[PDB]
């Protein structure tokens, strides 16, 4: 599971917490650090190096180290994950969630921002979105490409904490009605 | 649960589908349906009537049976329910969700378009949010005075057989990158 | 076919033009007339009136003439036709395409506009698209409800006029580069 | 004619279709496969390579093979084909239509995107759209340059299989009200 | 042409003025005078009233007064005038210019706008824009239907009062690229 | 001044917060509590009733009670109050800036908003901005024909309690960067 | 004034034209021919190169020629003219009108454009729109900096040979609505 | 203070005017000319080098002056300053204002358009708003990191000039309705 420390801290924010935008912020930050559990257990899963927002830029300079950064036409992202594998580029993007609508933007996105530097590079780049299904934690992985790479993907985690800790942020702001219908 | 026959119209499609866009169809069918069961059971826990698609103008037609359904300026919405008790109409949405994203649309698009409707009448308009969580499902309730009218209201069903299928079809489509990237 | 006073008109038309922005409009007017005729060929066949321009507002003073035209909230739609039979109001349209693009627009728009009105009269409103393939000379029609009253509608016509005009239009400007890209 | 391989795949589909969407998808196919059959015997008449979505800086990079890929500012357009003959780039777009509408759309947005590389590189662009009408199968080409570079163009084939296979496709979908509404 | 009051509070407006934006505002002015100017005498050539800022919904209840004008579903616009004759509305825009431009586009949103309407009351709406070429002073009229019914129109005008004003003020401000190149 | 008891309250918001986005509530909450206070003393300056948020078609009920508000066509605004007099109606706003943007916003919303209507009624609608500069303290007031109306209008007031207690917001929360950057 | 050519073959333009597009064809290469005719002859008063339509990548080779015209960023527009004297880029704009409303519209864009490569190449660039008025034929240039360096304009022309084909055109076509609402 | 040729001119320019539109160019100057006080005197309390206007690329050429700026894929914002040190970016607006509202627009946008030129020069680049709130004249900055580098900046200035300015330009022409409402 999570980390005792980060369990904590949640713990602590929900109980001093007395105000919707306060709560609203908390339920953010659970999603996102459920996100980042994720990409850390996958990492370790797929044994590859768990990676710390890496620009776009600097993704090409570690694979083309003679281009110059001041000059290369490249796009602005900064993907949660790449892999450089017999010359092709694998962009990764680390979901959790159970539908695919914030992947299909993620994967729009970062498809059509990367077409013109593969053709400038002649590195083929595939967009490699790896969601997990919260509920039924299975994993869904659209690029074929990279699963013939990894065809054996187990990632044996759950989500209960998060799961409780927003259980409990509800039942806590469960009669508030600026927090059940504020936005991020 | 869900009715056996339409657990079995589902299994059937499911079995049958052999394309992604026919799973997407099957995927946004289930959540309809989903949500379409916890109304009906809703509407049973809150002994109310289970209502068929009751466009704002027959909602008037039914408290203020004197107007004109000709003439009267009154929104263009239909509302999953509504009652009118004590000279208050509060008009009620179902939501099926883990989040509050698609409840603020729908809050704000009828608060909003009902705000000169209840002026013109001399009706407050209460706009009331029934979602259920169907993770953990808690029931989270948006208005209070509605609350105030229900303040015990226990809907005791789950989610199990649309988790089930959904299930099915995610690993039946799993290496179908149209599928898995594909919008409703 | 088209009849003498027409086709002459067009012949005469084509012979006398030398510039691209005539020619585009007699392009134009060529497929202006062909979806007439077919109205009116169509008309003929089901025995109906094919009508001139009658506008969504004159429609309902027609069906329903009780209504004050001066306040009436009725949608700004000019239909090609439509028949009001057993209570049902159906609203149609001619086509003359090879594909549906056209028809899914007009569908939408129409479908979209008419909601409100269907329930302030408390009638349906069914919108019908009658397309005729110039090609294969089939009818497709979408509403089902439609076919059912007219189970077997025949409507025994050729383009070969209209192609036969716009050849020639073609082979008068064909090595036009302002004729060949002009816009309607 | 199309290939026998290609033509029975169709007819393959099409048995085996149940669904408006299946059917949609297959109806697209038809014409995306009529375009590039139509492509295959243009290019056999123009003798060039059969090509399909070219990245533009592939274009540059043959016609100019010293420019630097990385740093070149130039669009990002994916035509058809191309030729570069006596210091002039023409720009290939093939089309199959009974009008010019789609071929006005491609021209504009390709002439507007090429001219500042037309410009930097101080090499005319000329945006060539050829379009074959499938009914009279007439070719019409915009470009008065680029058909006084050719001797008289004649692509003599038809779409008689391709019309086969829609009508087949009708016969089965052509009372599916979602089939005749659907879009691509 | 124009008064004689009208002229020298313009003159003395130019001869005070000191500021770009003040220059443009009696620029401005001038150019919304001459058409009114035209407007008068345009009027006074039709031998019709010469109206006031009417608007739509007045138009309506002038020709139809048993409209009730809380209820009524009516375009909001303010055309320069009209006329009610044979149970047709002539909408009438007054213009002085030596392009078309102007007039395309107040057209186009009269005619769109007034469809709607001219349904309702089951009464023909016709939009005339009338302008006046100020150079040639030549007269044109988009509208058969109207020319049909007055097919002989003088209107014996110039503008170089005008002309001559807006030459003044450019004489004394035509060297600030501020004024130049004022919206 | 300020009512003690509400003086208190901000206090005692003030003494509890611990977050930027507590904080910025408190400070939108002091600047509607500012608005409302010049409200009130204006009112009483004026004879009018303290009014906030009217519906404009109470308005209209109030000055013409023979409408029938079901029909009448009519904008939707909530202007802060209203005067009616000589069949005038003037329709007032308070502001309480050191400049007039938002003053000239509100003022071209109303004016824009409420042309129709006022011909429908044939009642002059005059729109009244009612600014004071905090800092100065002299009330700046658009209208002619409000100001001819009414003589010298004074409202002696000051705002040094409201400033105190942002000052006191400031102390605490002045050196975090989310408080100084967040967004109402 | 025009070439006796130019004339002609818009006479006759206008004798065969049966149609309102191509009548309407007429109206605007009347106009273009008069923008140009106004640049032809601006430019010989100047004593500068009358150019024919240069983009901006091709100014920018011309002043600084060690430019690699494949990787500079840089505007693309194409200006009537330019001139460069003691490093500064004067980019020129002809206009023929009454109105200065046209001009704004082309000072706005040329100057926020050419910004970003004024600073790259360390150049100033300043953006000279040169109108005349067709009536009064006075000559207004919203550039101090450009009437500094050429105080003392005089282009002694005259538009009367365009408005008098302007005039058969309007003649020919005046009583046809499609015409004079056509954009 | 403001100085005398700066103070003088304004005094002149108030008593001249007699226009709404003259009147306003004063209101807007006399507030850009106290944000470039304010700028002035911050900078010597910084000791720091007060600038004129100084483009981004500008930025670049001073403090990595290998960069070829015909090149350069740099922002095209012009901040008020910057401080290089420590091989630390700091990008520095002014503001003079009771809110923090343009605080928010002006870092938002610069934030964003630093973010790709910060990856490309590996500098991180730190957005600094300065502001002083000119009733309480206390300073609010942003930065954190800009602060533990000038820990106690004392910029002790007042605005009482300005406010004189405008109480003047007010009394002349407060009871000018198109003053009242003139936008900038
Ligand atoms: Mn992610
Ligand atoms: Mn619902
Ligand atoms: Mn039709
Ligand atoms: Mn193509
Ligand atoms: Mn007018
Ligand atoms: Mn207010
Ligand atoms: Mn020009
Ligand atoms: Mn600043």
């Given at each position: 599971?999570?980390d005792?420390?980060?369990?904590?801290?949640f713990?602590?924010?929900?109980?001093?917490?007395?105000?919707?935008?306060?709560?609203?912020?908390?339920?953010?930050?659970?999603?996102?650090?459920?996100?980042?559990?994720?990409?850390?257990?996958?990492?370790?899963?797929?044994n590859?190096?768990?990676?710390?927002?890496?620009?776009f830029?600097?993704?090409?300079?570690?694979?083309?180290?003679?281009?110059?950064?001041?000059?290369?036409?490249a796009?602005?992202?900064?993907?949660?994950?790449?892999?450089?594998?017999?010359?092709?580029?694998?962009?990764?993007?680390?979901?959790?969630?159970?539908?695919n609508?914030?992947?299909?933007?993620?994967?729009?996105?970062?498809?059509?921002?990367?077409?013109?530097?593969?053709?400038?590079?002649?590195?083929?780049?595939?967009?490699?979105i790896?969601?997990?299904?919260?509920?039924?934690?299975?994993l869904?992985?659209?690029?074929?490409?990279?699963?013939?790479?990894?065809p054996?993907?187990?990632?044996?985690?759950?989500?209960?904490?998060?799961?409780?800790?927003?259980?409990?942020?509800?039942?806590?702001?469960?009669?508030?009605?600026?927090?059940?219908?504020?936005?991020?």
């Amino acid at each position: 599971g999570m980390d005792y420390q980060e369990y904590q801290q949640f713990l602590a924010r929900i109980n001093t917490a007395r105000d919707a935008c306060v709560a609203k912020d908390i339920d953010v930050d659970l999603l996102m650090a459920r996100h980042d559990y994720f990409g850390r257990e996958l990492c370790k899963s797929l044994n590859i190096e768990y990676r710390n927002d890496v620009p776009f830029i600097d993704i090409i300079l570690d694979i083309r180290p003679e281009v110059d950064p001041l000059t290369i036409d490249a796009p602005h992202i900064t993907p949660d994950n790449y892999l450089y594998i017999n010359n092709v580029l694998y962009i990764i993007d680390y979901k959790v969630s159970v539908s695919n609508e914030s992947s299909v933007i993620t994967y729009d996105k970062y498809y059509e921002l990367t077409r013109d530097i593969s053709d400038r590079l002649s590195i083929p780049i595939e967009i490699v979105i790896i969601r997990i299904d919260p509920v039924s934690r299975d994993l869904h992985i659209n690029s074929d490409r990279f699963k013939e790479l990894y065809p054996t993907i187990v990632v044996d985690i759950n989500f209960n904490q998060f799961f409780d800790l927003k259980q409990l942020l509800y039942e806590k702001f469960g009669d508030d009605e600026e927090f059940l219908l504020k936005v991020a």
